[PDB]
Amino acid sequence: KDQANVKGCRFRVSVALPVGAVVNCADNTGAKNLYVISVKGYHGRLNRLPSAALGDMVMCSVKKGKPELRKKVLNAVIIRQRKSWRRKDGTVIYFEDNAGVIVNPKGEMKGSGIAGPVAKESADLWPKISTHAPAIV
RNA sequence: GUGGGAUUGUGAAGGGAUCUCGCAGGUAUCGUGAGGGAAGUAUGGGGUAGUACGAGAGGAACUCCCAUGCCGUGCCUCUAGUUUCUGGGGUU
Ligand SMILES: [Mg+2]
Ligand SMILES: [Mg+2]
Ligand SMILES: [Mg+2]
Ligand SMILES: [Mg+2]
Ligand SMILES: [Mg+2]
Ligand SMILES: [Mg+2]
C-alpha cells in the first residue's frame, strides 16, 4: 500500500514505543539512532502518550549520526520491537532490539541496505522495505 | 362468649366490681411489571475508478466487504506481572 494509513490494513499489535523512545536505525544512511516524536494516525485521549508498534510510521529526529541529518524532523517506519505480540495463529513472538528505518513521506526508503531481520507485519504494509529486507520473519 | 393478666401510695386472708389484651394465620416456590435508570460512538482500507466532470492541470460518492480508535460489560485457555504454598534448591 505504501501509505501512512495502516490501522485499516493491519491487525492489532501491542504498542511498544511511547513518545521519547530511542531506537536503532537499521539503514545505511549514517544515522545511528532515532528519537520518537509522534505517531501517524493517533487520535487523542487525555493524559495518554502516543505509542507506536510494528509497521507504524513515526516522526523522529536523529540524535547520534552524521551532522547533515541532525536537528531535523524526519519520517521513519518501525520494523523491530522488543515488546512481545500475539499473532492470530496463537504464536507469541518478540525481537531482541527496537529498530526502525528512515523513509519518505510517501514511503520511499532513503538508503539501500537493511541490517537484521524485518517483521512480516511491516513487510506487508511497505513493499520497498520488503524488497531490501535480508530476511522476513 | 371464651382465655389470660391488672387495679392508688398504710398488715394479712376470702369474695365482688371494673379495666386492658388475644381469639387466624404460618411457612416455601414460580411469576407479573407500574415507576425509575439507560449507550454505543468514530476513522481508515478494498471496490466503485484515473470512472463521472473537465480543453487541460486535476479528480469524487452510495449498496457491499475487511480492519482499527475511544467507550462499555465480563473472563483467566494462552502470554506477561505478583509468592508468607517461606514449595524445592543454592549460599554468608
Ligand atoms: Mg495531563
Ligand atoms: Mg421505562
Ligand atoms: Mg467499534
Ligand atoms: Mg507466569
Ligand atoms: Mg500465575
Ligand atoms: Mg537458607
PDB file of C-alpha atoms (C1' of nucleotides) and ligand atoms in Angstrom:
ATOM      1  CA  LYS A   1       0.000   0.000   0.000  1.00  0.00           C
ATOM      2  CA  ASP A   2       2.846   2.368   0.947  1.00  0.00           C
ATOM      3  CA  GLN A   3       0.504   4.780   2.737  1.00  0.00           C
ATOM      4  CA  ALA A   4       0.561   6.224   6.250  1.00  0.00           C
ATOM      5  CA  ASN A   5      -2.889   4.699   6.913  1.00  0.00           C
ATOM      6  CA  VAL A   6      -2.116   1.301   8.439  1.00  0.00           C
ATOM      7  CA  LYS A   7      -4.887   0.684  11.003  1.00  0.00           C
ATOM      8  CA  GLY A   8      -7.374  -0.337   8.313  1.00  0.00           C
ATOM      9  CA  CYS A   9      -4.977  -2.872   6.784  1.00  0.00           C
ATOM     10  CA  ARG A  10      -3.046  -4.220   9.802  1.00  0.00           C
ATOM     11  CA  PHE A  11      -4.183  -6.382  12.699  1.00  0.00           C
ATOM     12  CA  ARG A  12      -3.784  -5.204  16.279  1.00  0.00           C
ATOM     13  CA  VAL A  13      -0.231  -5.198  17.650  1.00  0.00           C
ATOM     14  CA  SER A  14       0.618  -4.398  21.267  1.00  0.00           C
ATOM     15  CA  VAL A  15       2.067  -0.897  21.489  1.00  0.00           C
ATOM     16  CA  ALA A  16       5.727  -0.755  22.415  1.00  0.00           C
ATOM     17  CA  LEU A  17       7.309   2.695  21.969  1.00  0.00           C
ATOM     18  CA  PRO A  18       5.752   5.792  23.575  1.00  0.00           C
ATOM     19  CA  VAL A  19       6.910   9.334  22.809  1.00  0.00           C
ATOM     20  CA  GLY A  20      10.529   9.821  23.830  1.00  0.00           C
ATOM     21  CA  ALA A  21      11.832   6.350  22.972  1.00  0.00           C
ATOM     22  CA  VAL A  22      15.194   5.964  21.235  1.00  0.00           C
ATOM     23  CA  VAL A  23      15.568   3.072  18.791  1.00  0.00           C
ATOM     24  CA  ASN A  24      18.309   1.840  16.494  1.00  0.00           C
ATOM     25  CA  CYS A  25      18.450   2.810  12.827  1.00  0.00           C
ATOM     26  CA  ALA A  26      18.796  -0.274  10.635  1.00  0.00           C
ATOM     27  CA  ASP A  27      19.527   1.530   7.348  1.00  0.00           C
ATOM     28  CA  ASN A  28      22.909   2.660   5.970  1.00  0.00           C
ATOM     29  CA  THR A  29      22.209   6.397   5.774  1.00  0.00           C
ATOM     30  CA  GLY A  30      24.699   7.323   8.509  1.00  0.00           C
ATOM     31  CA  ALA A  31      22.172   7.769  11.312  1.00  0.00           C
ATOM     32  CA  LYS A  32      22.826   5.737  14.453  1.00  0.00           C
ATOM     33  CA  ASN A  33      19.559   6.135  16.390  1.00  0.00           C
ATOM     34  CA  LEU A  34      16.093   7.676  16.145  1.00  0.00           C
ATOM     35  CA  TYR A  35      14.090   9.606  18.747  1.00  0.00           C
ATOM     36  CA  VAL A  36      10.312   9.181  18.590  1.00  0.00           C
ATOM     37  CA  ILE A  37       8.345  12.440  18.429  1.00  0.00           C
ATOM     38  CA  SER A  38       4.849  11.305  17.411  1.00  0.00           C
ATOM     39  CA  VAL A  39       2.894   8.560  15.652  1.00  0.00           C
ATOM     40  CA  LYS A  40       0.809   8.895  12.498  1.00  0.00           C
ATOM     41  CA  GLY A  41      -2.878   8.121  12.872  1.00  0.00           C
ATOM     42  CA  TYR A  42      -3.079   8.647  16.642  1.00  0.00           C
ATOM     43  CA  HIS A  43      -6.374  10.004  17.942  1.00  0.00           C
ATOM     44  CA  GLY A  44      -6.073  11.696  21.292  1.00  0.00           C
ATOM     45  CA  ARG A  45      -7.098  10.816  24.828  1.00  0.00           C
ATOM     46  CA  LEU A  46      -6.410  12.918  27.912  1.00  0.00           C
ATOM     47  CA  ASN A  47      -3.039  12.163  29.578  1.00  0.00           C
ATOM     48  CA  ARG A  48      -2.248   9.216  27.258  1.00  0.00           C
ATOM     49  CA  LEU A  49       1.069   9.262  25.421  1.00  0.00           C
ATOM     50  CA  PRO A  50       1.071   8.328  21.721  1.00  0.00           C
ATOM     51  CA  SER A  51       2.670   4.926  21.229  1.00  0.00           C
ATOM     52  CA  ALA A  52       3.956   3.118  18.140  1.00  0.00           C
ATOM     53  CA  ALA A  53       4.170  -0.540  17.141  1.00  0.00           C
ATOM     54  CA  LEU A  54       5.332  -2.648  14.202  1.00  0.00           C
ATOM     55  CA  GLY A  55       4.589  -1.230  10.775  1.00  0.00           C
ATOM     56  CA  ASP A  56       3.883   2.266  12.093  1.00  0.00           C
ATOM     57  CA  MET A  57       5.217   5.471  10.576  1.00  0.00           C
ATOM     58  CA  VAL A  58       6.569   7.946  13.126  1.00  0.00           C
ATOM     59  CA  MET A  59       8.029  11.430  13.163  1.00  0.00           C
ATOM     60  CA  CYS A  60      11.544  11.323  14.572  1.00  0.00           C
ATOM     61  CA  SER A  61      14.888  13.092  14.815  1.00  0.00           C
ATOM     62  CA  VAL A  62      18.471  11.844  14.751  1.00  0.00           C
ATOM     63  CA  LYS A  63      20.441  12.177  17.992  1.00  0.00           C
ATOM     64  CA  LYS A  64      23.737  10.472  17.081  1.00  0.00           C
ATOM     65  CA  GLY A  65      24.928  10.310  13.493  1.00  0.00           C
ATOM     66  CA  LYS A  66      26.203  12.324  10.576  1.00  0.00           C
ATOM     67  CA  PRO A  67      25.793  16.088  11.134  1.00  0.00           C
ATOM     68  CA  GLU A  68      23.904  16.529   7.850  1.00  0.00           C
ATOM     69  CA  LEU A  69      20.928  14.567   9.247  1.00  0.00           C
ATOM     70  CA  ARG A  70      20.647  16.089  12.723  1.00  0.00           C
ATOM     71  CA  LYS A  71      18.386  18.849  14.081  1.00  0.00           C
ATOM     72  CA  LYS A  72      15.540  17.983  11.697  1.00  0.00           C
ATOM     73  CA  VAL A  73      12.198  16.175  11.719  1.00  0.00           C
ATOM     74  CA  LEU A  74      12.127  13.007   9.598  1.00  0.00           C
ATOM     75  CA  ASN A  75       9.822  10.073   8.845  1.00  0.00           C
ATOM     76  CA  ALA A  76      10.614   6.527   9.950  1.00  0.00           C
ATOM     77  CA  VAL A  77       8.979   3.096   9.848  1.00  0.00           C
ATOM     78  CA  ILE A  78       9.224   0.693  12.785  1.00  0.00           C
ATOM     79  CA  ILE A  79      10.497  -2.753  11.792  1.00  0.00           C
ATOM     80  CA  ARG A  80      11.577  -4.437  15.062  1.00  0.00           C
ATOM     81  CA  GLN A  81      10.280  -4.193  18.631  1.00  0.00           C
ATOM     82  CA  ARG A  82      11.126  -5.866  21.943  1.00  0.00           C
ATOM     83  CA  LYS A  83       7.580  -5.945  23.334  1.00  0.00           C
ATOM     84  CA  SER A  84       6.071  -9.344  22.594  1.00  0.00           C
ATOM     85  CA  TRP A  85       2.935  -9.564  20.480  1.00  0.00           C
ATOM     86  CA  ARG A  86       0.436 -12.314  19.692  1.00  0.00           C
ATOM     87  CA  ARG A  87      -0.439 -13.363  16.149  1.00  0.00           C
ATOM     88  CA  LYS A  88      -3.821 -14.718  15.093  1.00  0.00           C
ATOM     89  CA  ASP A  89      -2.409 -18.244  14.774  1.00  0.00           C
ATOM     90  CA  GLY A  90      -1.677 -18.211  18.511  1.00  0.00           C
ATOM     91  CA  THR A  91       2.082 -17.569  18.484  1.00  0.00           C
ATOM     92  CA  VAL A  92       3.639 -15.015  20.838  1.00  0.00           C
ATOM     93  CA  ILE A  93       6.835 -13.520  19.442  1.00  0.00           C
ATOM     94  CA  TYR A  94       9.331 -10.729  20.116  1.00  0.00           C
ATOM     95  CA  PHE A  95      12.714  -9.472  18.911  1.00  0.00           C
ATOM     96  CA  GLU A  96      15.953  -8.595  20.713  1.00  0.00           C
ATOM     97  CA  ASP A  97      16.098  -4.843  19.969  1.00  0.00           C
ATOM     98  CA  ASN A  98      13.985  -1.944  18.703  1.00  0.00           C
ATOM     99  CA  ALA A  99      14.833  -0.853  15.164  1.00  0.00           C
ATOM    100  CA  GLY A 100      13.437   1.456  12.502  1.00  0.00           C
ATOM    101  CA  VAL A 101      14.250   2.730   9.017  1.00  0.00           C
ATOM    102  CA  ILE A 102      14.190   6.294   7.644  1.00  0.00           C
ATOM    103  CA  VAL A 103      11.752   6.744   4.739  1.00  0.00           C
ATOM    104  CA  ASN A 104       9.925   9.346   2.643  1.00  0.00           C
ATOM    105  CA  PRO A 105       6.505  10.801   3.474  1.00  0.00           C
ATOM    106  CA  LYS A 106       5.283   8.620   0.587  1.00  0.00           C
ATOM    107  CA  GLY A 107       7.023   5.533   1.988  1.00  0.00           C
ATOM    108  CA  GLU A 108      10.032   5.561  -0.335  1.00  0.00           C
ATOM    109  CA  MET A 109      13.074   4.322   1.552  1.00  0.00           C
ATOM    110  CA  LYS A 110      16.151   6.509   1.955  1.00  0.00           C
ATOM    111  CA  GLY A 111      19.197   4.262   1.841  1.00  0.00           C
ATOM    112  CA  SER A 112      19.825   0.980   0.071  1.00  0.00           C
ATOM    113  CA  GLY A 113      20.541  -1.630   2.757  1.00  0.00           C
ATOM    114  CA  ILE A 114      18.989  -3.105   5.886  1.00  0.00           C
ATOM    115  CA  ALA A 115      20.800  -4.924   8.694  1.00  0.00           C
ATOM    116  CA  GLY A 116      18.911  -7.651  10.532  1.00  0.00           C
ATOM    117  CA  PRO A 117      15.533  -9.315  10.048  1.00  0.00           C
ATOM    118  CA  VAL A 118      12.301  -7.478   9.268  1.00  0.00           C
ATOM    119  CA  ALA A 119       8.850  -8.308  10.617  1.00  0.00           C
ATOM    120  CA  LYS A 120       6.160  -9.546   8.243  1.00  0.00           C
ATOM    121  CA  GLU A 121       3.673  -7.027   9.656  1.00  0.00           C
ATOM    122  CA  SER A 122       5.927  -4.244   8.349  1.00  0.00           C
ATOM    123  CA  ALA A 123       6.926  -6.003   5.128  1.00  0.00           C
ATOM    124  CA  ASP A 124       3.301  -6.441   4.056  1.00  0.00           C
ATOM    125  CA  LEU A 125       2.476  -2.767   4.581  1.00  0.00           C
ATOM    126  CA  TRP A 126       5.651  -1.356   2.989  1.00  0.00           C
ATOM    127  CA  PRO A 127       6.891  -3.054  -0.212  1.00  0.00           C
ATOM    128  CA  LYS A 128      10.246  -1.305  -0.718  1.00  0.00           C
ATOM    129  CA  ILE A 129      11.381  -2.318   2.772  1.00  0.00           C
ATOM    130  CA  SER A 130      10.260  -5.844   1.906  1.00  0.00           C
ATOM    131  CA  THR A 131      12.427  -5.605  -1.212  1.00  0.00           C
ATOM    132  CA  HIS A 132      15.520  -4.586   0.760  1.00  0.00           C
ATOM    133  CA  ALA A 133      14.942  -6.902   3.737  1.00  0.00           C
ATOM    134  CA  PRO A 134      17.646  -9.590   4.086  1.00  0.00           C
ATOM    135  CA  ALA A 135      15.144 -11.880   5.833  1.00  0.00           C
ATOM    136  CA  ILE A 136      11.434 -11.588   6.632  1.00  0.00           C
ATOM    137  CA  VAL A 137      10.474 -13.219   9.924  1.00  0.00           C
TER     138      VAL A 137
ATOM    139  C1'   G B   1     -68.915 -15.750  74.595  1.00  0.00           C
ATOM    140  C1'   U B   2     -64.065 -17.811  75.663  1.00  0.00           C
ATOM    141  C1'   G B   3     -58.609 -17.441  77.667  1.00  0.00           C
ATOM    142  C1'   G B   4     -55.149 -14.694  80.077  1.00  0.00           C
ATOM    143  C1'   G B   5     -53.489 -10.613  83.220  1.00  0.00           C
ATOM    144  C1'   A B   6     -54.042  -5.866  86.323  1.00  0.00           C
ATOM    145  C1'   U B   7     -56.214  -2.114  89.556  1.00  0.00           C
ATOM    146  C1'   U B   8     -53.824   4.094  94.405  1.00  0.00           C
ATOM    147  C1'   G B   9     -49.198   5.026  97.718  1.00  0.00           C
ATOM    148  C1'   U B  10     -50.579   2.149 105.335  1.00  0.00           C
ATOM    149  C1'   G B  11     -50.638  -5.517 107.971  1.00  0.00           C
ATOM    150  C1'   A B  12     -52.650 -10.073 106.433  1.00  0.00           C
ATOM    151  C1'   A B  13     -56.974 -13.917 104.440  1.00  0.00           C
ATOM    152  C1'   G B  14     -61.630 -14.545 101.409  1.00  0.00           C
ATOM    153  C1'   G B  15     -65.120 -12.815  97.818  1.00  0.00           C
ATOM    154  C1'   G B  16     -67.250  -8.789  94.139  1.00  0.00           C
ATOM    155  C1'   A B  17     -66.810  -4.945  90.571  1.00  0.00           C
ATOM    156  C1'   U B  18     -64.127  -2.615  86.742  1.00  0.00           C
ATOM    157  C1'   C B  19     -60.293  -2.185  83.120  1.00  0.00           C
ATOM    158  C1'   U B  20     -56.627  -3.904  79.110  1.00  0.00           C
ATOM    159  C1'   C B  21     -55.098  -7.624  75.749  1.00  0.00           C
ATOM    160  C1'   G B  22     -55.699 -12.403  72.446  1.00  0.00           C
ATOM    161  C1'   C B  23     -59.465 -15.282  69.772  1.00  0.00           C
ATOM    162  C1'   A B  24     -56.350 -16.808  62.370  1.00  0.00           C
ATOM    163  C1'   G B  25     -52.896 -17.203  60.086  1.00  0.00           C
ATOM    164  C1'   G B  26     -47.959 -19.560  59.253  1.00  0.00           C
ATOM    165  C1'   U B  27     -44.212 -21.329  56.051  1.00  0.00           C
ATOM    166  C1'   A B  28     -41.894 -22.436  50.864  1.00  0.00           C
ATOM    167  C1'   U B  29     -41.608 -21.796  45.353  1.00  0.00           C
ATOM    168  C1'   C B  30     -42.767 -19.876  40.252  1.00  0.00           C
ATOM    169  C1'   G B  31     -44.090 -15.302  38.052  1.00  0.00           C
ATOM    170  C1'   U B  32     -46.387 -10.050  36.593  1.00  0.00           C
ATOM    171  C1'   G B  33     -44.285  -5.171  35.781  1.00  0.00           C
ATOM    172  C1'   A B  34     -46.442   0.462  37.143  1.00  0.00           C
ATOM    173  C1'   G B  35     -42.305   3.688  38.070  1.00  0.00           C
ATOM    174  C1'   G B  36     -37.059   4.929  37.799  1.00  0.00           C
ATOM    175  C1'   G B  37     -32.165   4.354  35.058  1.00  0.00           C
ATOM    176  C1'   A B  38     -30.460   3.863  30.284  1.00  0.00           C
ATOM    177  C1'   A B  39     -25.146   3.670  25.423  1.00  0.00           C
ATOM    178  C1'   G B  40     -22.587   2.846  21.905  1.00  0.00           C
ATOM    179  C1'   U B  41     -19.806   6.277  19.065  1.00  0.00           C
ATOM    180  C1'   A B  42     -15.993   7.490  15.231  1.00  0.00           C
ATOM    181  C1'   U B  43     -11.858   6.687  11.471  1.00  0.00           C
ATOM    182  C1'   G B  44      -9.389   4.022   7.568  1.00  0.00           C
ATOM    183  C1'   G B  45      -8.599   0.339   3.504  1.00  0.00           C
ATOM    184  C1'   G B  46     -10.667  -2.760  -0.887  1.00  0.00           C
ATOM    185  C1'   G B  47     -14.082  -1.968  -4.891  1.00  0.00           C
ATOM    186  C1'   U B  48     -16.704   1.599  -7.467  1.00  0.00           C
ATOM    187  C1'   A B  49     -12.184   4.063 -10.651  1.00  0.00           C
ATOM    188  C1'   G B  50      -7.803   7.501 -13.222  1.00  0.00           C
ATOM    189  C1'   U B  51     -14.691   6.422 -13.801  1.00  0.00           C
ATOM    190  C1'   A B  52     -18.498  10.702 -13.598  1.00  0.00           C
ATOM    191  C1'   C B  53     -16.892  16.330 -14.554  1.00  0.00           C
ATOM    192  C1'   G B  54     -13.162  18.853 -17.244  1.00  0.00           C
ATOM    193  C1'   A B  55      -9.562  21.945 -23.209  1.00  0.00           C
ATOM    194  C1'   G B  56      -6.054  20.562 -19.609  1.00  0.00           C
ATOM    195  C1'   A B  57      -3.915  20.604 -14.551  1.00  0.00           C
ATOM    196  C1'   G B  58      -6.782  17.626 -11.817  1.00  0.00           C
ATOM    197  C1'   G B  59     -10.259  14.458  -9.700  1.00  0.00           C
ATOM    198  C1'   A B  60     -15.362  12.266  -6.242  1.00  0.00           C
ATOM    199  C1'   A B  61     -19.612   9.328  -3.926  1.00  0.00           C
ATOM    200  C1'   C B  62     -23.735   5.270  -2.407  1.00  0.00           C
ATOM    201  C1'   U B  63     -25.175  -0.569  -2.000  1.00  0.00           C
ATOM    202  C1'   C B  64     -21.359  -4.474  -0.464  1.00  0.00           C
ATOM    203  C1'   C B  65     -16.834  -6.499   2.004  1.00  0.00           C
ATOM    204  C1'   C B  66     -12.253  -6.057   5.520  1.00  0.00           C
ATOM    205  C1'   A B  67      -9.846  -3.696   9.717  1.00  0.00           C
ATOM    206  C1'   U B  68      -8.924  -0.036  13.582  1.00  0.00           C
ATOM    207  C1'   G B  69      -9.527   4.234  17.740  1.00  0.00           C
ATOM    208  C1'   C B  70     -12.409   5.699  22.073  1.00  0.00           C
ATOM    209  C1'   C B  71     -16.063   3.955  25.449  1.00  0.00           C
ATOM    210  C1'   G B  72     -18.868  -0.094  27.985  1.00  0.00           C
ATOM    211  C1'   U B  73     -19.760  -5.134  30.249  1.00  0.00           C
ATOM    212  C1'   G B  74     -17.237  -9.535  31.505  1.00  0.00           C
ATOM    213  C1'   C B  75     -13.340 -13.597  31.581  1.00  0.00           C
ATOM    214  C1'   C B  76      -8.241 -16.311  33.018  1.00  0.00           C
ATOM    215  C1'   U B  77      -7.398 -21.304  27.821  1.00  0.00           C
ATOM    216  C1'   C B  78      -2.582 -18.782  26.136  1.00  0.00           C
ATOM    217  C1'   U B  79       1.469 -14.723  27.200  1.00  0.00           C
ATOM    218  C1'   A B  80       3.124 -11.253  30.874  1.00  0.00           C
ATOM    219  C1'   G B  81       3.138  -9.380  36.453  1.00  0.00           C
ATOM    220  C1'   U B  82       2.761 -10.827  41.570  1.00  0.00           C
ATOM    221  C1'   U B  83       4.760 -15.652  46.235  1.00  0.00           C
ATOM    222  C1'   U B  84       4.071 -15.868  53.720  1.00  0.00           C
ATOM    223  C1'   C B  85       2.267 -22.870  49.201  1.00  0.00           C
ATOM    224  C1'   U B  86       8.995 -19.139  53.376  1.00  0.00           C
ATOM    225  C1'   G B  87       7.277 -25.432  47.831  1.00  0.00           C
ATOM    226  C1'   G B  88      12.344 -27.270  46.034  1.00  0.00           C
ATOM    227  C1'   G B  89      17.384 -25.969  45.656  1.00  0.00           C
ATOM    228  C1'   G B  90      21.799 -22.879  46.490  1.00  0.00           C
ATOM    229  C1'   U B  91      24.752 -19.543  49.525  1.00  0.00           C
ATOM    230  C1'   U B  92      27.157 -15.685  54.063  1.00  0.00           C
TER     231        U B  92
HETATM  232 MG    MG C   1      -2.028  15.744  31.831  1.00  0.00          MG
HETATM  233 MG    MG C   2     -39.237   2.764  31.154  1.00  0.00          MG
HETATM  234 MG    MG C   3     -16.431  -0.426  17.115  1.00  0.00          MG
HETATM  235 MG    MG C   4       3.514 -16.973  34.648  1.00  0.00          MG
HETATM  236 MG    MG C   5       0.407 -17.090  37.856  1.00  0.00          MG
HETATM  237 MG    MG C   6      18.829 -20.871  53.996  1.00  0.00          MG
END
